């Protein structure tokens, strides 16, 4: 059941780096269409095109706020219902993982969350967490109080097999928006991963930011949870010419990305075994995968012809994502 997992594609305005690249926008975004078309060339020159039709499609032009509004606001209501929701950003850094996170998205969100809840008037508490997945290890950003790595182990809580429990991380509740920001600023610093040669900044680690909201009204008690996941991406080591350690780390994640593509193809498969446990990320994710959790994916792509692989890889992904059946259920609790 659940609504199908929602997938939107965003094409970045040609990155300045792209411009230095003199990358050319093969990519065409027809937001009316919600079509995105890529000059593959096929074998042929990229007269050849590959065209996809998307749940939502944003050209470079698409303004950030708009995106959010269209994607976040509906999620926020689900959180207030008790939904568990997750939004994952995939794509290129140029495409604006960074463009998206630098600005909101996070700072904007906590303000709105309190505003909607308090207008709701529900008695509520808000707790946040921020961790980074680096080379298959967990590190607490959110609480500098907590360690650089939050004490991280995960077990099954029997209620949901997919449902898991991450012992030791603490979210600290604050009724006010303000307290959250103070954490927010703190968290960010911890969050930051390694910069890259190619990009000023890169996400070495996948970042998972989670906001849990406890709501009580006269008595019905609901709990809403939102996970904002920012993909960690690798570049070809060979291209990078990065130090071996750097290459290695990139390779690990990169390889992990294949693993991620493998599980995804399984989900498409509806194959008996879904390799959630092969990554900590997909295990944590695990209950969300077409799961009860209401999930949305924002795939960012570069018009640049230069990176064939990523464009192809994204395209493949977008197909795979739909296949898995997302059963968001409002996790409304009384």
């Amino acid at each position: 059941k659940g609504k199908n997992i929602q997938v939107v594609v965003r094409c970045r305005p040609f990155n300045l780096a792209e411009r230095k690249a003199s990358a050319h926008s093969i990519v065409e975004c027809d937001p009316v269409r919600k079509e995105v078309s890529v000059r593959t060339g096929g074998l042929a020159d990229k007269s050849s095109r590959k065209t996809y039709t998307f749940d939502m499609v944003f050209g470079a032009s698409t303004k950030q706020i708009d995106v959010y509004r269209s994607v976040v606001c509906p999620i926020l209501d689900e959180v207030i219902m008790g939904y568990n929701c997750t939004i994952f950003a995939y794509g290129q850094t140029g495409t604006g993982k960074t463009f998206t996170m630098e600005g909101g998205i996070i700072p904007r969100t906590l303000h709105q969350i309190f505003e909607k809840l308090t207008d709701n008037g529900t008695e509520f508490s808000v707790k946040v967490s921020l961790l980074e997945i680096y080379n298959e290890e967990l590190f607490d950003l959110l609480n500098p109080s907590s360690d650089v790595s939050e004490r991280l182990q995960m077990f099954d809580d029997p209620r949901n097999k997919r449902g898991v429990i991450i012992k030791g991380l603490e979210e600290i509740t604050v009724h006010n928006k303000d307290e959250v920001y103070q954490i927010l600023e703190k968290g960010a610093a911890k969050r930051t991963t390694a910069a890259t040669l190619m990009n000023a900044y890169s996400s070495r680690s996948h970042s998972v930011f989670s906001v849990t909201i406890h709501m009580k009204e006269t008595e019905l008690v609901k709990i809403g949870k939102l996970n904002l996941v920012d993909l960690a991406g690798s570049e070809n080591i060979g291209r990078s010419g990065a130090v071996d350690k750097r290459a290695r780390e990139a390779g690990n994640i990169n390889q992990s990305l294949l693993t991620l593509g493998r599980v995804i193809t399984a989900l498409v498969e509806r194959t008996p075994h879904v390799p959630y446990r092969e990554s900590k990320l997909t295990r944590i994710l695990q209950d969300s995968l077409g799961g009860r959790t209401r999930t949305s994916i924002i795939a960012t792509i570069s018009p640049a012809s230069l990176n064939l692989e990523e464009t192809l890889s994204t395209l493949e992904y977008a197909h795979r994502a739909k296949n898995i059946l997302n059963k968001p259920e409002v996790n409304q609790k009384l």
Partner: protein, 438 residues
């Protein structure tokens, strides 16, 4: 005269080249020490001589060759061998860390370190030497080393030299059986990109050649060395023509340019005839017709192919031993009259072929008996493309499996590149078909 250097990639590349070199030494009669007790090389440094080695020291001949390997193993053998004494350590290099079979990783990881030395090493020789008409490449498709190495090599060599011709004698996995799982991944991925850079690429029918040679042998087994032996000898014949004028000597490359109407067709398939096993050598004295006819038969064809299926846009003939063009003509009439070989409409003419004064070259300790004449032919067929496809499919299956990705990704290689290999292959097949059609 001109000197050539051979490059060996992978265990296979070195071994095969190794066969080549020693043969050269023997054929010259230059002692494996490198300074022949025999007199100095023919005509002093003959063109053949210079390519094989240079006389310096003076009074020493040192081969022009570079041996590269990721894995220390094969190269160390060289060090062991007597030939090693001939080869000054500069020429021979070993690599600490093997391919082990990753084209991408071997290529990336190994290549970076290795290249600088090799390029320098080659460079110095290149500078010193007058130059090569071209150079030969050895490597293994299957071997990771060949795969990774070649890819790195191809771009760099191509970029730097530009004009200098490149030829690659590569081992094409027999459709019968790969070596590794990896091999299909390695081969396809490595091959396609590199090939475009390369003027032409050569692949071997391990199965076809091994079967054919072995069967020709009528021997339970050919030795791997013996198998190499065939390869070396043919090559030597090739060298001989250019090196020393035969009845007709032609610029091999220049002729080759004629031979391949298209850069699109990197190489015509080449055959050597008569197909001579030791026994085969014994059995008959080859005649112009006989050799040609023998050559035509797929049995002769090292590669397993239906020559019928492919068209012959054109073929080349090499000649060895005494020959008279009259005989050639007689063969010509025979061939021409014979329907069986199909000529592409495009090329009305068989021409051209060349003849060598000297009897065919042989690899030392050659298993096969000498043949009066040696010939090589180039043909372009769709079928040859098909063989590639044949391998491709398995690779495709692998891709379908999408298994053997994270190793590659560790190397950061994509699927897309692979897909590109496949698509390029499909490309290429289409092109081959297009050209193939008369």
């Amino acid at each position: 005269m001109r000197e050539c250097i051979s490059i060996h990639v992978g265990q296979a590349g070195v071994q095969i080249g190794n066969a080549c070199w020693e043969l050269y030494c023997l054929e010259h009669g230059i002692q494996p020490d490198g300074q022949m007790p025999s007199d100095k090389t023919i005509g002093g440094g003959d063109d053949s001589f210079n390519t094989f080695f240079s006389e310096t020291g003076a009074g020493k001949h040192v081969p022009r060759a570079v041996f590269v390997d990721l894995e220390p193993t094969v190269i160390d053998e060289v060090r062991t061998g007597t030939y090693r004494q001939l080869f000054h350590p500069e020429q021979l290099i070993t690599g600490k860390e093997d391919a082990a079979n990753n084209y991408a990783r071997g290529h990336y990881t190994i290549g970076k370190e290795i290249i600088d030395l090799v390029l320098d090493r080659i460079r110095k020789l290149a500078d010193q030497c007058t130059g090569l008409q071209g150079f030969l490449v050895f490597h293994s498709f299957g071997g990771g080393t060949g795969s990774g190495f070649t890819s790195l090599l191809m771009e760099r060599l191509s970029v730097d030299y530009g004009k200098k011709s490149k030829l690659e004698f590569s081992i094409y996995p027999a459709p019968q059986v790969s070596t590794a799982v990896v091999e299909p991944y390695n081969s396809i991925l490595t091959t396609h990109t590199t090939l475009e850079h390369s003027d032409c690429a050569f692949m071997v029918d391990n199965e076809a050649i091994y079967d054919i040679c072995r069967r020709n042998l009528d021997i339970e087994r050919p030795t791997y060395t013996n198998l190499n032996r065939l390869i070396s000898q043919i090559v030597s014949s090739i060298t001989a023509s250019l090196r020393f004028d035969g009845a007709l000597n032609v610029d091999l490359t220049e002729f080759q340019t004629n031979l391949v109407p298209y850069p699109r067709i990197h190489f015509p398939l080449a055959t050597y005839a008569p197909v001579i096993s030791a026994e085969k050598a014994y059995h008959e004295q080859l005649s112009v017709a006989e050799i040609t006819n023998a050559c035509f038969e797929p049995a002769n064809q090292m590669v397993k192919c239906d020559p019928r299926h492919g068209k012959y846009m054109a073929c080349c003939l090499l000649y060895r031993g005494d020959v008279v063009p009259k005989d050639v003509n007689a063969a010509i009439a025979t061939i021409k009259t014979k329907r069986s070989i199909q000529f592409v409409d495009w090329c009305p003419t068989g021409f051209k072929v060349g003849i060598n004064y000297q009897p065919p070259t042989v690899v030392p300790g050659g298993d096969l008996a000498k043949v009066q004449r040696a010939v090589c032919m180039l043909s372009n067929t769709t079928a040859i493309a098909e063989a590639w496809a044949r391998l491709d499919h398995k690779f495709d299956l692998m891709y379908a499996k999408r298994a053997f990705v994270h190793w590659y990704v560790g190397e950061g290689m994509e699927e897309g590149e692979f897909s590109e290999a496949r698509e390029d292959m499909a490309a290429l097949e289409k092109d081959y078909e297009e050209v193939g059609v008369d």
